[PDB]
Amino acid sequence: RGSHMYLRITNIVESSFFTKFIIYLIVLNMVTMMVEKEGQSQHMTEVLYWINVVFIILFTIEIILRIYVHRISFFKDPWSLFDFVVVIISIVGMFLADLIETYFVSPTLFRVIRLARIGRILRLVTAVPQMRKIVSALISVIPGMLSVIALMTLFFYIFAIMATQLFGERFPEWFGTLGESFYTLFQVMTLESWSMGIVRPLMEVYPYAWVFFIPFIFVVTFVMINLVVAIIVDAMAILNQKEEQHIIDEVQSHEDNINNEIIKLREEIVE
């Protein structure tokens, strides 16, 4: 009773056991969602319903335990925040989706309420510590790219304006609007059928179309290369910075041992 429970129950939630236990629950719930299937017995559907109910309450006590220990800090970790949303959506998607669709009927909901399934897959990222590590690593790369992504987006916009006006009048399915031209230039950037599918047909009508797309390919390839090179040397800087300090620290360790002893050589003259 009292905070003695809180001290003991933190020793549960923060335990390596509890983390691993929840991981297997997610895996098992992910597996049951693989045998869900329209062509099946009513008896299989009824059994899966109860099993899916068992999971939804079982993850509920997980969220309650995690909130009970982390409290005001729980609603600030993006990982814990995601898990909470998924449990809420998974409650609605099994005990209220029908009551919604039967009144707020929309054809999207029969396709959007599936999100309760996709969310329970993504929990396998949030629960596994090695997966949180790799995902946060990938996300932290994005801020360094924003300036070159903005540049690429601006170059695309300029070329989409030009391609619409140059080629859109006679090839509207490819360049007839700014949106058409944006999509087609993205295809060209990926080099997908860029010549046989796009630029060779154009040159039957616009012989100098190659003067547009070949410089385009050089630019966006050059910017993509420099984008990747930036990521490489950014990650390398994170390494080198560590090696640098260790060498400086040892120089300052060496500074300690030598200088703080060579000081004594002037007072040890009394010997």
Partner: antibody
């Protein structure tokens, strides 16, 4: 061989409606824009509709805007012209024609069907 | 919306004669965008010259085309009896095809 055959036509009353159909063979129909061209009884040729190869863009002269509707089915390899509010002006041989270049909605009409006569008369 | 006008409307011509017919354009157009068709009695038009001067596949090399800007022409160096037909010039601009009035060749006996 490339081949185009129009069908429908015949006699309509003014204000009436009629649907022409064109069947295409011997080429990748979905690679080409298609057009309909009138030939009036005094043998003047007059373009009346164009459709892009994917069907998403359609073009008409002001003489028929909103009265006619060009459409295509790339699976059936067929082309249609829904005509409505027909007038005596619209009495003509109607030809189905393929564009010279692929995807190009302009340029020239390199193959023409045999035509179907449409008479609009009371 | 560009109008194409052709002259003459009828041309009484004799085998072996050099025949030349004109298509005049109410605006300057690219010579790559002007086309010629040949239509024979109770058949559909067939493409004849692509751009101002490139003959279509199978056109007898006695045919030729020349022009630029607002004025274009089709020529037969020496007429043959099979050339008796109506010839239509055509252009494309904006998003509209327009056709010339046609020139009917009349073989002279």
């Amino acid at each position: 061989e490339v081949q185009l055959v129009e069908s429908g036509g015949g006699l309509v009353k003014p204000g009436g409606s009629l649907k022409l159909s064109c069947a295409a063979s011997g080429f990748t129909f979905s690679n080409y824009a298609m057009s309909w061209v009138r030939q009036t009884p005094e043998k003047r040729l007059e373009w009346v509709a164009t459709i892009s190869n994917g069907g998403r863009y359609t073009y008409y002269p002001d003489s028929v805007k909103g009265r006619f509707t060009i459409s295509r089915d790339n699976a059936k390899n067929s082309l249609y012209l829904q005509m409505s509010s027909l007038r005596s002006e619209d009495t003509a041989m109607y030809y189905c024609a393929r564009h010279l270049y692929r995807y190009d909605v302009g340029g020239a009409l390199d193959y023409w069907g045999q035509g179907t006569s449409v008479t609009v008369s009371s | 919306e560009i109008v194409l006008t052709q002259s003459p409307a009828l041309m009484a011509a004799s085998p072996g004669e050099k025949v030349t017919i004109t298509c005049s354009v109410s605006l300057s157009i690219s010579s790559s965008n002007l086309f010629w068709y040949q239509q024979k009695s109770e058949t559909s038009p067939k493409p004849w010259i692509y751009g101002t001067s490139k003959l279509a596949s199978g056109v007898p090399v006695r045919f030729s085309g020349s022009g630029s800007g607002t004025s274009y022409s089709l020529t037969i160096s020496s007429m043959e009896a099979e050339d008796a037909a109506t010839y239509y010039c055509q252009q494309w601009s904006s998003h509209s095809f327009t056709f010339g009035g046609g020139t009917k060749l009349e073989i002279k006996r």
